[PDB]
Write a protein that binds this ligand. Structure first.
Ligand SMILES: O=C(N[C@H](CO)[C@H](O)c1ccc([N+](=O)[O-])cc1)C(Cl)Cl
Ligand SMILES: O=C(N[C@H](CO)[C@H](O)c1ccc([N+](=O)[O-])cc1)C(Cl)Cl
Ligand SMILES: O=C(N[C@H](CO)[C@H](O)c1ccc([N+](=O)[O-])cc1)C(Cl)Cl
Lengths: 139, 139, 139
């Protein structure tokens, strides 16, 4: 029931815009609110564990990225939420516990964690959304 | 007369130094104050609009980057200014309005916005200067 | 006895973890506390000076990275220290002065500054450590 910080941090960034999309500078993940349909993919999160043969790999979201067992991207102003679902691409079993996404079994797991839109949210206010996940293990 | 945020943010970074220039870490845009001559190029800003056939493409500078219809890079301490001119590389017509640089015509414009030194400023105090521009449209 | 800021900033980043290491997102410099052995290499810092034929090249650490003529990486919370040694890879002579690492001779020096662990610190609390160095010259 406890998470131990032991790994690097991965950041999932997304810019939400209207139909008229103006991309400035280098290419980045951007979408129109209309694209925020249920199950819509946001981006992958690579995970590579080492020396965790006797520990349950886990990812913890920043305090501003979870609440009520629900995960979500947060606008730069910490006001707007973009509810998402976290799910590995393989058939591995994971559990959610107060902002923590841990693996049900021990082992140095390596894989991809996909971030998807949880419920159609085409009304999402334009802005920059972020989801931060830190590597570690669960007990 | 109103700007709508709808796009990504582009950041133009520049480090001003003295004759003795000590570059630490990875290569970045750096110049000596003596290089801050009138019309001196600072860097390009790519712009790619989509779904703006009926909107006027626009770029808005951060509050700390404009004043009195004048644009300028700002030191990390928000104290020193480096006045610059914003101009597309093509023959397109643009207008400046209270920190907003919008296109005079509608259409999903794609192009390069150049940043140049506005007036010789070889006295610019050494430091890190930044100019942030956000994509959107004008009404 | 005085440092003049005149160059870019280089940042040395390191994530300290336990045996069970969970790497999230893109690859970054990460190590287990057990790897924090004396003289253990942390990372190189490239230095390229120009127009310093009559000046002593120098690197200044951020206020939070030095104290008592000692350099060290600092956790994101500014609480935990990771004492390190700064040493060029060549045979050049350098001096340490209140957070400043300057060259004993003048000239536009180009080289690599290595960051090593100063004394075994395998008890270092897991976290993200940073060491910021700014380019300039000494008088
Ligand atoms: O973005 C995702 N999937 C896309 C579909 O748009 C695609 O299937 C994909 C799969 C793996 C991947 N990766 O491993 O880097 C990247 C994209 C999910 Cl991982 Cl969120
Ligand atoms: O830097 C600029 N121009 C330089 C001249 O030093 C050069 O002409 C250039 C043009 C285009 C460009 N781009 O499109 O990426 C980059 C450099 C202006 Cl775009 Cl600010
Ligand atoms: O990391 C270092 N040295 C490593 C040993 O692990 C290696 O010798 C090295 C040397 C030079 C270098 N470089 O110049 O980029 C990188 C690694 C020291 Cl420069 Cl801190």
């Amino acid at each position: 029931g406890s998470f131990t910080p032991s790994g690097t941090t991965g950041t999932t960034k997304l810019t939400v815009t209207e139909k008229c999309q103006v991309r400035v500078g280098d290419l980045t993940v951007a979408k129109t609110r209309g694209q925020l349909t249920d199950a819509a993919p946001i981006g992958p999160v690579t995970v590579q564990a080492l020396g965790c043969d006797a520990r349950q790999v886990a990812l913890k979201a920043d305090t501003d990225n979870f609440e009520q067992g629900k995960f979500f991207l947060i606008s730069d102003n910490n006001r707007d939420k973009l509810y998402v679902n976290i799910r590995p691409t393989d058939n591995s079993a994971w559990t959610t516990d107060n902002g923590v996404f841990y693996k049900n079994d021990v082992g140095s797991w390596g894989g991809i964690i996909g971030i998807y839109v949880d419920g159609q949210q085409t009304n999402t206010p334009p802005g920059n959304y972020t989801l931060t996940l830190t590597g570690g293990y669960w007990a």
